[PDB]
Design a protein around this nucleic acid. Structure first.
Lengths: 78, 79, 101, 204
RNA sequence: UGAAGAGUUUGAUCAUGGCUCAGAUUGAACGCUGGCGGCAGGCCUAACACAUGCAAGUCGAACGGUCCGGAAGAAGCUUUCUUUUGGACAGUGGCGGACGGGUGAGUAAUGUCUGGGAAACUGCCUGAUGGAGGGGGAUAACUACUGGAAACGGUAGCUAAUACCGCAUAACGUCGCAAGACCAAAGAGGUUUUCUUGCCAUCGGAUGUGCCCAGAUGGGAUUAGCUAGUAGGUGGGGUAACGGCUCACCUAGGCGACGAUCCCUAGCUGGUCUGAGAGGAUGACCAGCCACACUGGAACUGAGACACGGUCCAGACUCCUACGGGAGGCAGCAGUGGGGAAUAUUGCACAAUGGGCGCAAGCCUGAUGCAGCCAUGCCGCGUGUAUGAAGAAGGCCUUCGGGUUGUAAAGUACUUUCGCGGGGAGGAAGGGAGCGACGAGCUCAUUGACGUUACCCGCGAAGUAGCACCGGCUAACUCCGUGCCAGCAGCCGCGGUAAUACGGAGGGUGCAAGCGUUAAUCGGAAUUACUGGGCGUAAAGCGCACGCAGGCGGUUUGUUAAGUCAGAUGUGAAAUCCC
């Protein structure tokens, strides 16, 4: 089942997530279908805490792609 | 896919073997090498005889060894 | 060493003495060892004195002894039954000798 | 680093490196101009490899840096465009500990390295305690507000008055600050080094 | 933007030629030594045998009893007992173990890689269309009895559903001919005339696969003729499906020096190391695929496992045993013993991220996040800083005049890693409650392993260093001892009384908690040379002829245009590499 969740590039004291759409089977940090944006928990690296690219996910959503609870929050924030 | 070859045998019925030949460069040396392959093409009309240079196209598997069929004859004969 | 191993254990078959070649003269101490590799080779015994008996059982390092043709290996002192040289105040790294107090 | 008798290195290199009291008439190179040891007297015999070796030696000794980083910095300068020789000194001269020395905050590079490690030196506000820090142009290197009181820098900066600074630099004794104008060229630096020889040694 | 060679076969020279060297790397080990911290990393050797614990459940919005808990009754109190209700276990009933995790034994084959084809299939989830009328039947629990040491088992009686079955409508679909006939389906919960969860049939979406095909995929021919279903045809059987896949009959072919057949070996790849490139080597960490769980074989049930904690049969072994008969299988985690040169805490924890089930609350989750041990590696830091004699003492050398180790130590001043005190982190919102129709939305409240660690502030003592080497390549020297004796040695060699190459000492060079040693990988080798080579005498034309296959082929014109060349487009996963 295709799902839109957060991929953790996360490094030591460098936690960054990549809201991506991919098969629920694949690993958390495996081959993803396509990146729709990014998330910075601390929002320290850049002022732009998150870039959703609404139109993009707006497509996957309705295509059968389901969004996780956490990702849904970020996406809902648009 | 279309392949050109010679009719090296018309012994079987409705079945003719076409000896297709090609030229490819050696992966190491690069010099052109000769390579051929025999394909059992279908010929319901038993129209093609031995020596005929015919064209061969991919078609619905008639048999296990036959997955090609005679399309058109290039030249009349060359033994 | 067979399995390209740095070292190889083995059991001594006989601890006899050998004489150097044309240019040299002495009673070099060697010993036939039956390594686990399945080979029975002769190894040299460095040091001024050793305590290798018949059932010695020692590790082989590997080294040719120019004077003794055939001896292509050296015994590692300080390992197994091969006691390290006594009173070695010098190169203790070799001969396996703990630094005195 | 090395940490040991520096006054002996000057004799070995033949040239007089500025480690400390190089100004005073004490600097052994003033008394006995021969390398240390019981053989510093007999006539030495140098080979092609020797001249290149001793050459880079004095070079690295001046900045008092390890042979590793020194080599690493060499590789870098050799990668970037422009004459390697020039770039070389540029990088080594870019070291924070070195800059501080050039600014006069420290009597020598060794003391400068200490000042940096002691967090007694800042860069563009934020403090930096890494001697290997690469100072870029337009960067301001001043003393710590809290360290402005320590007698050591008080005496160092005091002697700095009236003393000229390199063209690629500019200090303000009053504010006890400093600015890195640009990367110093080989023309600006007057080191007893022959960059053409140090580059050959690493060739091999 | 990319390429230095040197030593040694001579009395000397040139050439040919082999061997060898300084560098970098290694999930290493060994020797001497060893302070701290961060990140990373750790049986590379037997599928050898294993003590002990642990490695999947969840639902009372499917139904009847025990265990744990609360509340309300009959009582003056006690005993006893009744009703209601929460959790859960035991049972019945429903949905889930073929995912994840481990290992590489086996494996040359469309197994894999790359590019295509079609004779196919796909739970839960999503979109669309239509429907859900009437009836019938069954088995445990439970109850009673009997057998057994135990495991567990036999018999009798009662009983329910979204459990099973028969009948309707035909949206449609299937079959013959052509333009005909046949075949379907369970409720429950409530803010209950309105929604919620769920069901039946069909089409489509999403995704994942079975099968087929072109090309590519190691070594040996002291492995050459091989083959009977063996090659093809008709019909049939069989499967989700093609196919001799299997069968009957007929035909007699099919394959091979572009190497079949046989034998040997090794999981493969993305990538990794190296190299100027080509290429060589490798594929260990991580990611994809494949193949394996006491040894061997097999099938069932299912969308899927021929399935580690499912089943059946054969075999050995271990344990239990009233011996009648049973229980298992760490190549799962940790660990034990055995092996080896060698590789670790039978630790902490779920809050965070992710996963399974559930409407939800919530439950499960040694997956993982961390700590521990080891300089195994990488990076950062400290053992102090400034001052201090034409120049102590001591050791060493001496033409004993003196020189050297030395500003080096002592000593003076300064800072002050450890340690102590205080403070103390990021990494994490809802369930609920209030407003609103307990919906959308808004508002508010409660709660954390590593840690009391990181980090900040205050106080504050100078407070481990070693190892290798000094004939030449290799940078760095003398004295004494020994004396071809003892010993050294990668190669050339050295030692028979003056040795910078033996041992010690002083000194010196290199490096630094590291330093050496051993083993393994790379080029130089233009020494297989495609780029880069040779064959009269240094290694090298086959003794000659004829001739098959194969390779190559004169001048002009035309067609095709396969090779070749050009434009566009698709593919060329991520990561990596380069900027």
């Amino acid at each position: 089942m295709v799902t839109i969740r957060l991929a953790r590039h996360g490094a030591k004291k460098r936690p960054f997530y990549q809201v991506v759409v991919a098969d629920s089977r694949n690993a958390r940090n495996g081959r993803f279908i396509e990146r729709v944006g990014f998330f910075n928990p601390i929002a320290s690296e850049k002022e732009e805490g998150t870039r959703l690219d609404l139109d993009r996910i707006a497509h996957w959503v309705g295509q059968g792609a389901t969004i996780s609870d956490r990702v849904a929050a970020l996406i809902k924030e648009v | 896919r279309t392949l050109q070859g010679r009719v090296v045998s018309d012994k079987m019925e409705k079945s003719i073997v076409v000896a297709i030949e090609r030229f490819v460069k050696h992966p190491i040396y690069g010099k052109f090498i000769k390579r051929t392959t025999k394909l059992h093409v279908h010929d319901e009309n038993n129209e093609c005889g031995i020596g005929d240079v015919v064209e061969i196209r991919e078609c619905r598997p008639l048999s296990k060894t036959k997955s090609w069929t005679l399309v058109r004859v290039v030249e009349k004969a060359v033994l | 060493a067979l399995e390209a191993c740095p070292q190889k254990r083995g059991v001594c078959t006989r601890v006899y003495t050998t004489t150097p070649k044309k240019p040299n003269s002495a009673l070099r101490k060697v010993c036939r060892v039956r390594l686990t590799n399945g080979f029975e080779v002769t190894s040299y015994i460095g040091g001024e004195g050793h305590n290798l008996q018949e059932h010695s059982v020692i590790l082989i390092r590997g080294g040719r002894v120019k004077d003794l043709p055939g001896v292509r290996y050296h015994t590692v002192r300080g390992a197994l039954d091969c006691s390290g040289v006594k009173d070695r105040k010098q190169a203790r790294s070799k001969y396996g000798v703990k630094r005195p107090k | 680093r090395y940490l040991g008798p520096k006054l002996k290195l000057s004799r070995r290199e033949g040239t007089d490196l500025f480690l400390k009291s190089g100004v005073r008439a004490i600097d052994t190179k003033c008394k006995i101009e021969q390398a240390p040891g019981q053989h510093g007297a007999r006539k030495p015999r140098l080979s092609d490899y020797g001249v290149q070796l001793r050459e880079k030696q004095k070079v690295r000794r001046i900045y008092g840096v390890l042979e590793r980083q020194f080599r690493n910095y060499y590789k870098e300068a050799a990668r970037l465009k422009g004459n390697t020789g020039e770039n070389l000194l540029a990088l080594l001269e870019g070291r924070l500990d070195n800059v501080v020395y050039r600014m006069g905050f420290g009597a020598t590079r060794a003391e400068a390295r200490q000042l940096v490690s002691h967090k007694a030196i800042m860069v563009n506000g934020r403090v930096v305690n890494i001697a290997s820090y690469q100072v870029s142009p337009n960067d301001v290197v001043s003393i710590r507000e809290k360290a402005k009181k320590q007698s050591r820098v008080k005496a160092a900066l005091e002697l700095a008055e009236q003393r000229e600074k390199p063209t690629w630099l500019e200090v303000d004794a009053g504010k006890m600050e400093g600015t890195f104008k640009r990367k110093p060229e080989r023309s600006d630096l007057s080191a007893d080094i022959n960059e053409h020889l140090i580059v050959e040694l690493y060739s091999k």
